[PDB]
Amino acid sequence: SGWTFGAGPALQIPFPMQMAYRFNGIGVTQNVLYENQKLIANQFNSAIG
Amino acid sequence: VVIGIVNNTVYDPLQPELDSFKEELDKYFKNHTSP
Amino acid sequence: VVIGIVNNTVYDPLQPELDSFKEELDKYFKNHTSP
Ligand SMILES: *[C@@H]1O[C@H](CO)[C@@H](O[C@@H]2O[C@H](CO)[C@@H](O)[C@H](O)[C@H]2NC(C)=O)[C@H](O)[C@H]1NC(C)=O
Ligand SMILES: *[C@@H]1O[C@H](CO)[C@@H](O[C@@H]2O[C@H](CO)[C@@H](O)[C@H](O)[C@H]2NC(C)=O)[C@H](O)[C@H]1NC(C)=O
C-alpha cells in the first residue's frame, strides 16, 4: 500500500512502482529504476543476505 | 529494458495548434498548386 | 464558478512568435498567384 496506510484509507499499489515514487523525493528522477530494475534487485537481495 | 510496458498512443499537445495551422497550411497550397 | 475572477487578456506566446513568420508566410502564399 505504501505510505497511505498512515494517513487515511489504504490504497493498493504495485511494489516495483512504489520504489519509482521513492526515488522522486530524493533528487534523481524515476527514469533510472526501470532502466536498472534487475541490478537494484540483486543489490537489494545481496544486501539483506 | 523496462518490464510491464504497455503499448499506447500519446496525444501530443504541440501538434494540434500547428495541426490546425497544418490544416490551413495545406489549404494554402491547394490554391498555390491549382493553376 | 470561481468567485473573484477578473477579466483580462493573456499574451499566449506560441502564436505571435509563429505569426512573426506567418505574416511573411501569408504574404508569400497569396501573392504567388498575383502576377
Ligand atoms: C507494441 O507495438 C509494436 C509496434 O506496433 C510491436 O512491435 C511489432 O509488433 C508486431 C505485431 O505483433 C510484430 O510482428 C513485430 O515483431 C514487433 N516488432 C518487434 C521488433 O518485435 C510490439 O510487439 C507491441 N507490443 C505489445 C506488447 O503489444
Ligand atoms: C467578462 O466578460 C464577459 C463577456 O465579455 C462578461 O459577460 C457578460 O456579462 C454581462 C453582464 O450583464 C451580460 O449581460 C453578458 O451577456 C455577458 N456576456 C457573456 C458572453 O457572457 C462578464 O460580465 C465580464 N466579467 C466582468 C467581471 O466584468
From Swiss-Prot, chain A:
Domain of life according to the entry: Viruses
Function according to Swiss-Prot or TrEMBL: Subunit of the fusion protein that is processed upon entry into the host cell. Mediates fusion of the virion and cellular membranes by functioning as a class I viral fusion protein. Contains a viral fusion peptide that is unmasked after S2 cleavage. This cleavage can occur at the cell membrane by host TMPRSS2 or during endocytosis by host CSTL. In either case, this triggers an extensive and irreversible conformational change that leads to fusion of the viral envelope with the cellular cytoplasmic membrane, releasing viral genomic RNA into the host cell cytoplasm.
Protein name, entry field: Spike protein S2'
Organism of this sequence: Severe acute respiratory syndrome coronavirus 2
Encoding gene per record: S
From Swiss-Prot, chains B, C:
Glycosylation sites: 7, 31
Function (record text): Subunit of the fusion protein that is processed upon entry into the host cell. Mediates fusion of the virion and cellular membranes by functioning as a class I viral fusion protein. Contains a viral fusion peptide that is unmasked after S2 cleavage. This cleavage can occur at the cell membrane by host TMPRSS2 or during endocytosis by host CSTL. In either case, this triggers an extensive and irreversible conformational change that leads to fusion of the viral envelope with the cellular cytoplasmic membrane, releasing viral genomic RNA into the host cell cytoplasm.
Protein name per Swiss-Prot or TrEMBL: Spike protein S2'
